[PDB]
């Protein structure tokens, strides 16, 4: 029998199993019946278009439950402005095109955008606000956030992890309506763009207003040098006010930075390295107050020492705990003789992320591996005393379950040492991160390795990677490379290219992230005898056309003084040679002349300039991006045939 | 318990295996809507579900398209959620990674879209970030 | 019988127009072109308000043109004019959308009003495609109608 | 708005009857003034625009015949000023754009009240008796690099020649931004600049000029300023500031901005 003769119910069921958007688009072109099934089955839509032609919006997506309006071109452009009275129509427009929206993501450039678009769906359940631009001036705090509180509203999840605002705006909005704050079952405030995190009083007010929070994430300030820093009282108030918490993620803002120079105690000029206002007894009380906790994250930029007893209490008082992430928590594993202690007693953990533990040694790693025998993901950052022997033995202990390993900033564990340590799980590991450190002193098929993340200092080469041990990866499909450093002090590279052609060693590689955004250099003018960022972009992007990449995310290096991340001529020219590209996202700026280079790529469909960093370019005057240039580029790309 | 196929063949079914199917559990017990190989192919999977799993499942689904269609029809008749969802996902995997013409070629579907209709549907599809 | 007397009036007027041309089925184009007539209807004011380029009067009449020529591309049916041609399945989908839109606008609590009927007919792919080449946007005029409803 | 205002990305800011028109140098756009605009909008009406060769404009609007000489840019500037009803404007321009402003003032004296020039030069190529720029053979290398980039882009390959590959260590700074346009447009503009020579016309400029230069600049000699004060047909003043690089108004704002503001607000010259 053929597929068309099947009952329509199972046709809907089979079509609902197709989550790939490209294949759904292909399936909608088969026949009228397939078209109707796809249109009535599609559940999530990320809108792709320009602000100008929003009134050319199709009405065929009447069944989408998740709508993402945050990528409307031009990226970050105000969706609704008070300068145009017809902007209100946009609200109705959206409300009529997607009447079944329960989850909404929207770029909230202006308060009017929120006030007009968000209240359109009374049945809205999840809301995500995105804003990387500057905060518009309001009479009081949280005036724009107060626009979320609708009469027929029932918002349950609020996500502000990418919405830049003042930390005073959240408690002001949450305290203005008890019903809105009480209905929230999730609250994400884990935003790295805050100049400073939430104060102690702000955390207390937020938790007091929201007694039903099941998930709570926040960027707080734990540095005791500042006045109002979150400490023991804030954590106790969190535990008291929200007894139903299942996910608790508290982090210092600096701990959320992309650059390691902002949170690593060693790379900061003496910053950090001082005790925080967090005691072991305080943590014991907090953990006693949270019986339903399932995921815990305490990523601080100040030391918390002798925290072993609290983590021992975690095992007995939080039976549902599965994931733990610790930042600068010391004394986590201090085994004596052979008795386990500390985090080694949390046998129920499934993933564990560790950062900056001075006490940890090889025996500590052995204890963690022997105790947490259910561990499936392990991440260790900045441990100066662990070596290849301890990590290798820990990997052998967890060989049956460990499939995700990250080893970063470990002084005695370079690339070669990390790859030798991960040998017992070489045929089972699926995700892997190493630091491309080639200066560390002192049957090989990665059968199931699928994703490799690399961190490398600016000016270093990628060629030794194959010699490091990562040689035969038949299933490797996506590689993420992050480059960080200050190139204003380096001379010109003696070797012409960074060595992306090395990645030709992997036959199934098709997706890449090349994050050079944390390279600081000179944009358009160097003082004397110096090299601008165009030279480094050429150095890093040579050979990218030889790879058979179909998706590429590129982060151009920035000039911190001028605050620009412009694409250069070599960068555009080298990205132009990638014929097989399907999606190309550049996280910077580029003017019309360089953007028009990408029309040569025949198969290119998704191209966008996404300035998803703080602060984003405020207007067309401050950078080389223009709305007309974006519109012309979009028109030229769509009409290609 | 003994079940009877449409052609008249009789098979033996475990009590838990019988409870796997909602229709069988809720109701000799003849089955006049399924063939013998339908039972012969569903019994082992149901028994395993009563009791390496991914490899065994991949070896289980290595069957022809017509056989998979018979299996999904049988699962719909038996109202077995797990089998129906798994087989629907398997058939949906055949949809992904192919152009509309390839899909028509594989599933023998006649094309009734006029060029203007195809242009309109592609224009609508262009509003979605893939 | 599930329509208000004005909606039923315009529907049977569209039926009469369809029977005049003996064009097989009462497509949404017929009822929409009927909406273009009867100048007291909200469609004219909505169209003039939606597009600043539509402020020119005769351009509105071109809409009828963009329907009429499209209506000229329908083969006729061998049947007596004294009968009701079967309303197309697209027409039924439009009516069901009108009923649903009426339902969702009063959560507390069905005779469909004129304006919801107009919105539902504008939702039709063929009517929207006809309006597009005439520089008119069906989403824009629907949004204008819906905003004006709030008054 | 209008077609002229859209083709040049014209932005109007500030208030007041006096108008300050900011003209960027070649290879940059109006954004290079982002540090000077805040000091002006309070008591001036600022006009920002991009000339047609800029990378932020539509490359199709570029006319290789019209912009092969400075008169095209001068006429574009005049059209922009007349389209936005600007008269007696104060023009602040970077190198080789103030030359276009000077030619426009020759054509339309009424439009300009004063000219503020940052590192200008009437001729870029030094002759036997004229020391006012660079040697011909050192611009030959830049032209060769631009030609190579255009050839490589024509064949679909990446243009991989930059100004940092130049040997002079001053051409690296001077031509850094010339590699920031489409390669063919870059070649056309660079040839037009090299062949430019405004020495005969300097005596026909009647508007006052405020030449601003860098101390002992290695790119454009300071002597040029004195030369200009000898050949200009109107009042002229020259000031020297302790800055360096091709874009002092962007890289060194704390020194450049006070000088530019002082020369804008002082008219006696």
The closest alpha carbon to A629, from D56, D215, D23, C76, belongs to D56
Residue A463 C-alpha from the chain's centroid? 27
SS3 of residue A73 by DSSP: strand
Assigned domain for A367 exists: yes
Helix, strand, coil percentages (3-state) for chain C, rounded to 5, are 65, 0, 30
Domain shared by D165 and D207, yes or no: no
Q: Which residues of A touch D246 (CB under 8 A)?
A: 525
Mention every residue, 6+ apart, whose C-beta is less than 8 A from residue A603.
A579, A580, A581, A582
From A428, A424, A464, A468, select the one nearest A447 (Cα to Cα). Answer: A428
Do the beta carbons of residue B39 and residue B61 sit within 8 Å? no
In a domain, D260, yes or no: yes
Q: Which chains touch C (3 or more CB pairs under 8 A)?
A: A
Q: Please name which of D104, D71, D67, D68 lies closest in space to residue D89, comparing C-alpha atoms.
A: D104
Q: What angle do CA A17, A22, A24 make, to 5 degrees?
A: 40
**Radius of gyration of chain B from Cα atoms?**
19
Backbone φ and ψ for A590, nearest 5 degrees, come out as -160, 135
> HSE (CB half, 13 Å, CA atoms) of D115?
33
Chain A residues within 8 A of D30 when measuring between CB atoms: 621
Residues D234 and D256 reside in one and the same domain: yes
Q: Is A585 helix (H, G, I), strand (E, B) or coil?
A: strand
Same domain membership, residue D37 and residue D17: yes
Q: How many residues does chain B have?
A: 130
Are residues D82 and D117 both part of a single domain? Answer: yes
Contact present, D246 and D217 (Cβ < 8 Å): no
Instruction: Tell me how far apart the alpha carbons of residues C95 and A43 are, in angstroms, rounded to a whole number.
Output: 24
Domain that holds residue B20: 3-130
For this entry, resolution in Å reads: 2.8
Residue whose C-alpha is closest to residue B50's, from B13, B20, B87: B20
CB-CB contact of A196 with A253 (8 Å): yes
Closest chain B CA to residue A29: B100
Whether residues A81 and A143 share a domain: the answer is: yes
Chains A and C, touching by 3 or more CB pairs within 8 angstroms: yes
Which residue is listed with tokens 């060194």?
A: D252
Sign of CA dihedral D129, D131, D132, D133: positive
Backbone phi, psi, residue A554, to 5° = -120, 135
D231 marked among binding-site residues: yes
- Set of chain A residues whose Cβ sits within 8 Å of the Cβ of B92: 14-15, 17-18
CB within 8 Å: A55 and C123: no
Contact A601, A569 (CB under 8 A): no
Could you say which DSSP state residue D32 is in?
G
User: What does the angle CA A551 – CA A556 – CA A558 come to, to the nearest 5 degrees?
Assistant: 160
Token pair 């008249």 is found at B8
Return the closest-CA partner of residue A411 out of A368, A454, A380, A452: A380
| Contact at CB, C139 and A97, closer than 8 angstroms | yes
For residue D228, give the nearest of D130, D148, D158 by alpha carbon: D130
Of A1, A60, A638, the CB nearest to B124: A60
Domain identity same for A337 and A420: yes
Whole-angstrom Cα distance, residue A481 to residue D178? 31
What is the signed CA dihedral for A259, A263, A264, A269, rounded to 10 degrees?
100
**Residue D68's closest CA among D53, D50, D49?**
D53
Q: Which two tokens stand for residue A490?
A: 């380096």
**Residue A512 near residue A547, CB atoms below 8 Å:** yes
User: Within 13 Å of residue B25, how many CA atoms lie on the same side as its CB?
Assistant: 11
Q: Is A562 on the interface with D (CB under 8 A)?
A: yes
* Same domain, yes or no: A151 and A53: yes
**Cα D129 to the center of its chain, rounded Å:** 25
Give the minimum alpha-carbon distance from A582 to chain B in angstroms, rounded to a whole number: 10
Distances (CA, A) of A5 to A10, B76, B88, B91, B109: 11, 14, 15, 15, 10
- Listed by number, the residues of chain A in 444-463 with a beta carbon closer than 8 Å to a beta carbon of chain D are none
What radius of gyration, in Å, describes the C-alpha atoms of chain C? 15
**What are the b/e assignments for C116-136, b being 16+ CB within 10 Å?**
bbbbbbbbbbebbebbeebeb
A50 and A140 co-located in one domain = yes
Contact A573 D160 (CB under 8 A): yes
Torsional class of C69: left (φ above 0), alpha (ψ -120 to 50), beta (otherwise) = alpha
Q: Do A57 and B104 touch (CB under 8 A)?
A: no
The neighbour count for residue A5, using CB atoms within 10 Å, is 9
Q: Which two tokens stand for residue B74?
A: 């049988």
Cα gap A475→B77, rounded to integer Å: 39
Q: Any CB–CB contact under 8 A between A599 and chain D?
A: no
Contact A14 B104 (CB under 8 A): no
**Distance (Å) from the alpha carbon of D75 to chain A's nearest alpha carbon:** 23
Return d(Cα D148, Cα D134) in angstroms, integer: 21
Q: Which of A112, A137, A155 is the last residue of a domain?
A: A155
CATH of the domain at A5: 1.20.1280.50
| Cis amide leading into A615 (omega within 30) | yes
Kindly compute the dihedral angle of the four CA atoms of residues D145, D151, D153, D157, in this order, to the nearest 10 degrees: -100
Q: Give DSSP secondary structure letters for D211-245.
A: EEEETT-SSS-THHHHHHHHH-SS-EEEEEES--S
A427 is a domain residue? yes
Cα–Cα distance for residue pair C49/C36, rounded to 1 Å: 15
3-state secondary structure of D90: strand
Technique of determination: cryo-EM
d(CA B46, CA B40): 11
CB atoms < 10 A from the CB of A227, how many? Answer: 7
Judge whether A570 and A543 are in contact, CB under 8 Å: no
Nearest alpha-carbon partner for D143 in D116, D180, D178: D178
H-assigned helices in C22-56? 28-36, 42-50
What are phi and psi for residue D241, nearest 5 degrees?
A: -125, 150
Residue whose C-alpha is closest to residue A128's, from A77, A42, A191: A191
- Mark whether A14 and A75 lie in a shared domain: no
D131: in domain: no
Whole-number Å distance between alpha carbons of C98 and C112: 7
Cβ under 8 Å to A: D residues 195-214: none
SS3 state at B33: coil
The domain boundary residue, chosen from A120, A155, A190: A155
Q: Confirm if A387 and A412 have CB atoms less than 8 A apart.
A: yes
- In SS3 terms, A108-134 reads as CCCHHHHHHHHHHCCCCCEEEEEECCC
CA of D109 vs chain A CAs: smallest distance (Å): 29
Residue B19 and residue B55: Cα distance in Å, rounded?
A: 25
Helix H or strand E segment including D195: helix D183-195
Residues of D annotated as catalytic (active site), given as ranges: 95, 217, 246
Number of H helices, E strands in chain C: 8, 0
> DSSP of B55-117, one letter per residue?
HHHHHHH-S-HHHHHHHHHHHHHHT-HHHHHHHHHHHHHHHTT--HHHHHHHHT------HHH
Residue A78 lies in a domain: yes
* Pairwise CB contact (< 8 Å): A526 & D176: yes
**Same structural domain, D165 and D246:** no
Domains of chain C (ranges plus CATH)? 5-149 (1.10.1780.10)
For residue A400, is it within any domain?
Answer: yes
- A147 and A88 in a common domain: yes
Q: Can you tell me the distance from the alpha carbon of D261 to that of A439, in angstroms, rounded to the nearest whole number?
A: 52
Count the domains in chain D: 2
Confirm whether A299 is domain-assigned: no
Pairwise CA distance, residues C143 & A51, whole Å:
16
* Residue of chain A whose alpha carbon sits nearest to that of B75: A10
Distance CA A12, CA A18 (A): 10
In what helix (H) or strand (E) does residue A519 lie, and over which residues does it extend?
strand A511-520
Positive or negative: CA dihedral A39, A43, A48, A49: positive
Q: Check chain C for breaks (C–N over 2.5 Å) and list the residue before each, or none.
A: 109
Q: Which residues fall within 8 angstroms of residue A480, CB to CB, at 6 or more apart?
A: A451, A452, A453, A454, A512, A513, A515
Question: Do D152 and D183 have their domain in common?
Answer: yes
The residue behind tokens 């990446």 is D158
Q: By CA distance, what is D12's nearest residue in A?
A: A621
Query: For the domain that residue B12 is a member of, what is the CATH number?
Result: 3.30.710.10
What are D125's strand-pairing partners?
Answer: D134
Helix (H, G, I), strand (E, B) or coil at D154: helix
- Assess contact for A519 and A479: CB atoms under 8 A: no
Verify whether the Cβ–Cβ distance A577 to D156 is below 8 Å. yes
Task: Give how many domains chain B has, as a whole number.
Answer: 1
Domain count, chain A: 3
Domain range enclosing D178: 136-189
Residue A33: domain span: 1-42
The strand pairing partners of A304, in sequence order, are: A329
- D260: domain CATH number is 3.40.50.1820
For residues D39 and D59, what is the distance between their CA atoms, to the nearest angstrom?
A: 32
Neighboring chain A residues of D250 at a CB cutoff of 8 Å: 524-525, 562
Cα(A64)–Cα(D113) distance, rounded to whole angstroms? 61
In this complex, which of B104, B127, B130 lies closest to A49 when CB atoms are compared?
B127
Element (H, E) at D114: strand D112-118
CB contact under 8 A, A89 and C104: no
- Closest C-alpha to B118, from A44, A43, A640, A35: A35
Residue A428's beta-bridge partner residues? none
Cα atoms in the 13 Å half-sphere on the side-chain side of A176: 18
Q: Which residues of A177-213 are buried (b: 16+ CB within 10 A; e: fewer)?
A: beebbebbbbbbbbbbbbebbbbbebbbbbbbbbeeb
Shared domain for A357 and A424, answered yes or no, is yes
Q: Is residue A180 domain-resident? A: no
Apex A567 CA angle, A566 and A571, nearest 5: 155
Residues on chain A touching C143 (C-beta within 8 angstroms): 55, 89-90, 92-93, 96
Give the integer Cα–Cα distance in Å for A544 and A563: 26
Question: CA–CA separation, A298 vs A220, rounded Å?
Answer: 10
Whether the upstream peptide bond of residue A74 has omega within 30° of 0, thus cis, is yes
Residues A150 and A87 both lie in one domain = yes
* Helix intervals (H) in A98-214: 111-117, 143-146, 169-174, 178-183, 200-209
How far, in Å, CA of A192 to CA of D120, rounded? 45
**Pair D48, A621: CB distance under 8 Å:** yes
* Rounded-to-integer distance, Cα D51 and Cα D67, Å: 10
Q: CB neighbours (10 Å) of residue A530? A: 20
For residues A60 and A137, state if they share a domain. yes
The helix/strand/coil state of A51 is coil
């Amino acid at each position: 029998t053929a597929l068309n003769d099947l009952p329509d119910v199972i046709l809907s069921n089979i079509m609902a199993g197709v989550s790939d958007v490209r294949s759904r688009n292909s399936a909608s072109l088969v026949c009228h019946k397939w078209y109707l099934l796809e249109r009535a089955t599609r559940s999530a839509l990320t809108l792709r278009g320009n602000i100008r032609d929003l009134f050319m919006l199709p009405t065929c997506f009447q069944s989408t439950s998740h709508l993402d309006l945050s990528l409307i071109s031009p990226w970050g452009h105000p969706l609704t402005s008070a300068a145009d009275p017809d902007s209100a129509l946009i609200g109705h427009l959206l409300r009529h095109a997607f009447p079944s929206v329960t989850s909404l993501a929207i770029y909230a450039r202006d308060p009017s955008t929120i006030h007009i678009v968000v209240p359109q769906w009374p049945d809205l359940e999840r809301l995500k606000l995105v804003r990387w631009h500057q905060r518009p001036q309001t009479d009081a705090a949280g005036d724009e956030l107060k626009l979320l509180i609708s009469e027929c509203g029932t918002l349950k999840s609020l996500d502000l992890s990418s919405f830049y605002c003042w930390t005073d705006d959240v408690p002001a909005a949450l305290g203005s309506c008890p019903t809105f704050a009480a209905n929230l079952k999730s609250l994400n405030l884990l935003n790295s763009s805050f100049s400073e995190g939430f104060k102690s009083d702000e955390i207390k007010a937020i938790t007091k207003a929201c007694p039903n929070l099941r998930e709570f994430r926040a960027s707080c300030m734990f540095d005791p040098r500042y006045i109002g820093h979150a400490g023991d009282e804030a954590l106790v108030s969190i535990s008291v006010n929200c007894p139903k918490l299942e996910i608790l993620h508290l982090a210092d803002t600096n701990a959320l930075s992309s650059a390691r120079s902002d949170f690593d105690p060693d790379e900061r000029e003496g910053l950090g390295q001082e005790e925080a206002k967090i005691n072991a007894a305080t943590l014991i009380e907090v953990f006693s107050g949270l019986p339903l906790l399932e995921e815990l994250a305490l990523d601080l930029c100040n030391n918390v020492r002798d925290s072993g007893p609290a983590l021992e209490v975690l095992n007995s008082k939080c039976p549902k705990l599965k994931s733990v992430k610790l930042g600068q928590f010391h004394g986590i594993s201090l085994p004596v003789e052979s008795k386990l202690d500390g985090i080694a007693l949390c046998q129920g953990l499934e993933s564990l992320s560790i950062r900056n533990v001075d006490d940890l040694t090889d025996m500590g790693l052995i204890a963690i591996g022997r105790g947490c025998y259910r561990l499936a993901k392990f991440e260790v950052y900045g441990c100066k005393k662990i070596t290849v022997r301890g990590m290798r033995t820990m990997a052998s202990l967890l060989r049956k379950t460990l499939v995700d390993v990250k080893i970063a900033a470990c002084k005695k564990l370079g690339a070669v040492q990390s790859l030798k340590a991960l040998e017992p799980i070489q045929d089972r590991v699926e995700r892997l991160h190493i630091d491309c450190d080639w200066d560390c002193p002192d049957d090989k098929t990665w059968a199931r390795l699928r994703y490799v993340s690399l961190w490398i200092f600016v000016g270093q080469l990628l060629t030794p990677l194959v010699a490091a041990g990562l040689n035969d990866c038949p299933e490797l499909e996506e590689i993420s490379i992050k480059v960080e450093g200050d190139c204003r002090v380096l001379s010109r590279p003696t070797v012409r290219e960074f060595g992306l052609t090395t990645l030709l060693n992997y036959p199934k590689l098709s997706r890449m992230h090349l994050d050079c955004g944390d390279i600081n250099g000179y944009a358009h003018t160097a003082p004397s005898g110096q090299m601008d960022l165009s030279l480094w972009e050429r150095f890093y992007l040579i050979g990218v056309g030889h790879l058979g990449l179909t998706e590429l995310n590129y982060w151009p290096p920035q000039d911190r003084d001028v605050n620009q991340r412009s694409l250069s001529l070599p960068a555009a020219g080298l990205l132009q040679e990638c014929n097989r590209l399907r999606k190309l996202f550049i996280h910077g700026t580029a003017h019309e002349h360089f953007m028009m280079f990408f029309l040569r790529i025949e198969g290119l469909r998704d191209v966008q300039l996404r300035a998803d960093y703080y602060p984003a370019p405020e207007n067309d005057m401050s950078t080389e991006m223009r709305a007309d240039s974006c519109s012309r580029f979009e028109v030229a790309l769509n009409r290609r045939q | 318990i003994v079940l009877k196929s449409s052609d008249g063949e009789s098979f033996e079914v475990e009590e838990a295996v019988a409870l796997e199917s909602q229709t069988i559990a809720h109701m000799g017990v003849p089955l006049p809507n399924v063939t013998s190989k339908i039972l012969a192919k569903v019994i082992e999977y149901c028994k395993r579900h009563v009791e390496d799993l991914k490899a065994w499942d991949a070896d289980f689904m290595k069957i022809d398209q017509a056989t998979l269609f018979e299996l999904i029809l049988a699962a719909n008749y038996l109202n077995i959620k797990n089998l129906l969802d798994l087989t629907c996902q398997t058939v949906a995997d055949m949809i992904k990674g192919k152009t509309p013409e390839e899909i028509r070629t594989t599933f023998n579907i006649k094309n009734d879209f006029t060029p203007e209709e195809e242009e309109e549907v592609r224009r609508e599809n262009q509003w979605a970030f893939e | 019988q599930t329509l208000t007397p004005e909606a039923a009036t315009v529907l049977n007027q569209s039926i009469a127009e369809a029977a005049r041309r003996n064009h097989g089925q009462t497509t949404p184009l017929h009822v929409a072109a009927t909406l273009l007539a009867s100048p007291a209807g909200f469609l004219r004011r909505a169209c003039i308000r939606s597009h600043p380029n539509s402020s020119h009067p005769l351009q509105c009449r071109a809409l009828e043109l963009c329907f009429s020529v499209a209506l000229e591309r329908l083969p006729t049916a061998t049947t007596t004019p004294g009968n009701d041609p079967p309303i197309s399945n697209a027409l039924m989908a439009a009516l069901k959308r009108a009923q649903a839109h009426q339902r969702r606008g009063c959560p507390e609590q069905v005779k469909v009003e004129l304006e919801q009927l107009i919105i539902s007919i504008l939702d039709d792919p063929s009517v929207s495609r006809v309006m597009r080449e005439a520089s008119f946007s069906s989403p824009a005029v629907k949004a204008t109608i819906e905003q004006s409803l709030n008054n | 708005m209008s077609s002229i205002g859209l083709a040049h990305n014209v932005t109007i800011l500030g208030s007041g009857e006096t108008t300050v028109v900011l003209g960027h140098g070649y290879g940059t756009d109006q954004s290079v003034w982002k540090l000077l605009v805040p000091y002006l909008v309070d008591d001036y009406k600022v006009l920002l625009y991009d000339h047609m060769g800029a990378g932020t404009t539509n490359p199709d609007y570029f006319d290789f015949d019209r912009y092969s000489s400075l008169e095209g840019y001068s006429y574009d500037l005049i059209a922009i000023l007349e389209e936005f009803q600007v008269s007696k404007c104060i023009y602040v321009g970077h190198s080789m754009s103030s030359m276009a402003a000077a030619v426009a003032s020759i054509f339309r004296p009424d439009l300009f009240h004063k000219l503020v020039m940052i590192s200008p030069t009437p001729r870029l190529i030094n002759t036997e008796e004229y020391y006012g720029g660079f040697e011909q053979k050192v611009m030959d290398e830049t032209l060769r690099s631009l030609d190579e980039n255009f050839k490589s882009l024509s064949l679909g390959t990446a243009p991989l020649l930059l100004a940092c590959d130049l040997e002079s260590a001053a051409m690296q700074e001077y031509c850094r931004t010339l590699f920031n346009m489409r390669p063919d447009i870059a070649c056309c503009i660079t040839r037009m600049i090299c062949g430019l020579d405004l020495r005969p016309y300097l005596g026909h400029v009647t508007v006052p000029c405020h030449i601003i230069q860098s101390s002992n600049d290695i790119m454009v000699p300071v002597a040029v300023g004195e030369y200009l004060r000898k050949n200009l047909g109107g009042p002229s003043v020259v000031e020297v500031m302790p800055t360096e690089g091709h874009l002092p108004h962007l890289s060194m704002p704390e020194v450049t901005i006070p000088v530019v503001l002082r020369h804008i607000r002082q008219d006696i010259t």
